[PDB]
Design an enzyme around this catalytic site. Structure first.
Site, PDB file in Angstrom:
ATOM      1  N   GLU A   1       6.266 -22.745  -6.469  1.00  0.00           N
ATOM      2  CA  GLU A   1       4.810 -22.644  -6.459  1.00  0.00           C
ATOM      3  C   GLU A   1       4.123 -22.528  -5.101  1.00  0.00           C
ATOM      4  OE1 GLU A   1       3.551 -26.019  -8.782  1.00  0.00           O
ATOM      5  OE2 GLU A   1       4.661 -25.385 -10.539  1.00  0.00           O
TER       6      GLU A   1
ATOM      7  N   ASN B   1      10.301 -19.518  -7.274  1.00  0.00           N
ATOM      8  CA  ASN B   1       9.801 -19.777  -8.620  1.00  0.00           C
ATOM      9  C   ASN B   1       8.290 -20.015  -8.641  1.00  0.00           C
ATOM     10  OD1 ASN B   1      10.567 -20.372 -11.433  1.00  0.00           O
ATOM     11  ND2 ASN B   1      10.026 -22.490 -10.967  1.00  0.00           N
TER      12      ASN B   1
ATOM     13  N   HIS C   1       4.829 -20.923 -18.702  1.00  0.00           N
ATOM     14  CA  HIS C   1       4.257 -22.027 -19.476  1.00  0.00           C
ATOM     15  C   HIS C   1       3.069 -21.368 -20.161  1.00  0.00           C
ATOM     16  CE1 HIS C   1       6.699 -25.281 -17.976  1.00  0.00           C
ATOM     17  NE2 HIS C   1       6.448 -24.932 -16.726  1.00  0.00           N
TER      18      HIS C   1
ATOM     19  N   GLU D   1      10.996 -21.828 -17.044  1.00  0.00           N
ATOM     20  CA  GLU D   1      10.484 -23.038 -17.690  1.00  0.00           C
ATOM     21  C   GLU D   1       9.651 -22.743 -18.932  1.00  0.00           C
ATOM     22  OE1 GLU D   1       8.420 -25.163 -14.703  1.00  0.00           O
ATOM     23  OE2 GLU D   1       9.951 -24.849 -13.164  1.00  0.00           O
TER      24      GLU D   1
ATOM     25  N   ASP E   1       7.868 -22.609 -22.477  1.00  0.00           N
ATOM     26  CA  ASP E   1       7.289 -23.444 -23.522  1.00  0.00           C
ATOM     27  C   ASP E   1       5.994 -22.751 -23.921  1.00  0.00           C
ATOM     28  OD1 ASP E   1       5.395 -24.336 -21.565  1.00  0.00           O
ATOM     29  OD2 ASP E   1       6.474 -26.208 -21.272  1.00  0.00           O
TER      30      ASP E   1
END
Ligand SMILES: O[C@@H]1[C@@H](O)[C@H](O[C@@H]2CO[C@@H](O[C@@H]3CO[C@@H](O)[C@H](O)[C@H]3O)[C@H](O)[C@H]2O)OC[C@H]1O
Ligand SMILES: O[C@@H]1[C@@H](O)[C@H](O)OC[C@H]1O
Length: 302
Positions: free
Chosen positions: A132, A173, A210, A238, A240
């Site tokens: 990030e 990432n 996300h 990641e 979801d």
């Protein structure tokens, strides 16, 4: 454990893995969770044990109990590992963020990368070297690393990682790289092109993914855009999705399946209760650690 393994079916299409996350607690809280991990997923990312706060709580003093356990579980069960994460502004001890001398921070940065990477040298498939580092508009986030060292910290981190463990894939990432044309996606792309042209060893771009409900369909274009950065590979790191709809999940799986550079997908959790976004029921397994509709949808799509 679901009878049909989506990892096995994803690998059948030439992909490297369809994995998930874990650490001591979720791997031992009950019998179904570790059993699901062993049967249906082929890769593991430590949810928190490899972060700076958990590995180097005090300057030069490392704590590897949690990370050792995760690595040992994965290695003992044939699961690939993605280290996460070496340099990040969040979950960073105050001793690091208080440093103001450039050379002192570089020394600290290199020692942290070197010690954590050396401990698992040769056992890590990929390392999220940087996490990030971008603002939503595509500019570089003003973290302590950026503020004190400047943009050169990007080169330093990757070069140190490359020499410490040349066997691991080095990744940058980030989240919100979910639709083509989004400022952050444009910024990630232009910066990586620049860094790769300068010789910085960046093997891949990780897109957290996300998502909110309905956002699955735009992921395919986002991955296509990210592929233009020029890295060897990319991955959904990641995943979801609020609501965990079959349409969203299948859309995201197809997004990776149909892009040559996407080596795999890591879902940020196994069952809903253990999700960092549990109130949105964003995972593939429910409160009873049983496969949800989306899980079967993914299986039937492969
Ligand atoms: O006390 C600690 C908790 O507060 C902490 O919660 C975790 C926060 O990070 C989550 O993982 C991150 C999610 O956001 C992404 O962008 C990052 O890349 C991920 O690493 C994690 O799911 C939460 O459990 O950590 C656990 C306790 O030590
Ligand atoms: O358990 C540790 C293992 O995970 C690491 O890779 O090598 C040193 C061991 O102590």
């Amino acid at each position: 454990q679901a009878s049909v393994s989506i990892d096995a079916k994803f690998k059948a299409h030439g992909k490297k893995y369809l994995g998930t996350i874990g650490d001591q607690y979720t791997l031992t809280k009950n019998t179904k969770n570790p059993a699901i991990i062993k049967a249906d997923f082929g890769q593991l990312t430590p949810e928190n044990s490899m972060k700076w706060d958990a590995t180097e709580p005090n300057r030069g003093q490392f704590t590897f109990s949690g990370s050792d356990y995760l690595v040992n579980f994965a290695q003992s069960n044939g699961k690939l590992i993605r280290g996460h994460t070496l340099v990040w502004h969040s979950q960073l001890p105050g001793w690091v963020s208080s440093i103001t001398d450039k050379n002192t921070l570089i020394s600290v940065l290199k020692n942290h990368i070197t010690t954590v990477m050396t401990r698992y040298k040769g056992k890590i498939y990929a390392w999220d070297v940087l996490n990030e580092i971008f603002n939503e508009d595509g500019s570089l986030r003003n973290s302590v690393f950026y503020n004190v060292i400047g943009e050169d910290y990007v080169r330093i981190a990757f070069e140190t990682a490359r020499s410490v463990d040349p066997n691991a894939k080095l990744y940058i990432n980030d989240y919100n790289l979910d639709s083509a044309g989004y400022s952050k996606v444009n910024g990630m792309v232009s910066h990586v092109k620049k860094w790769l042209a300068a010789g910085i060893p960046i093997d891949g771009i990780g897109s957290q993914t996300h998502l909110g409900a309905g956002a699955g369909s735009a992921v395919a274009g986002a991955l296509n855009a990210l592929a233009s950065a020029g890295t060897k590979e990319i991955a959904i790191t990641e995943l979801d999705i609020a609501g965990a709809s079959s349409t969203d999940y299948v859309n995201v799986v197809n997004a990776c399946l149909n892009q040559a550079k996407c080596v795999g997908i890591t879902v940020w959790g196994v069952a809903d209760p253990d999700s960092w976004r549990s109130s949105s029921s964003p995972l593939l397994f429910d409160g009873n650690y049983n496969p949800k509709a989306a899980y079967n949808a993914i299986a039937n799509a492969l």
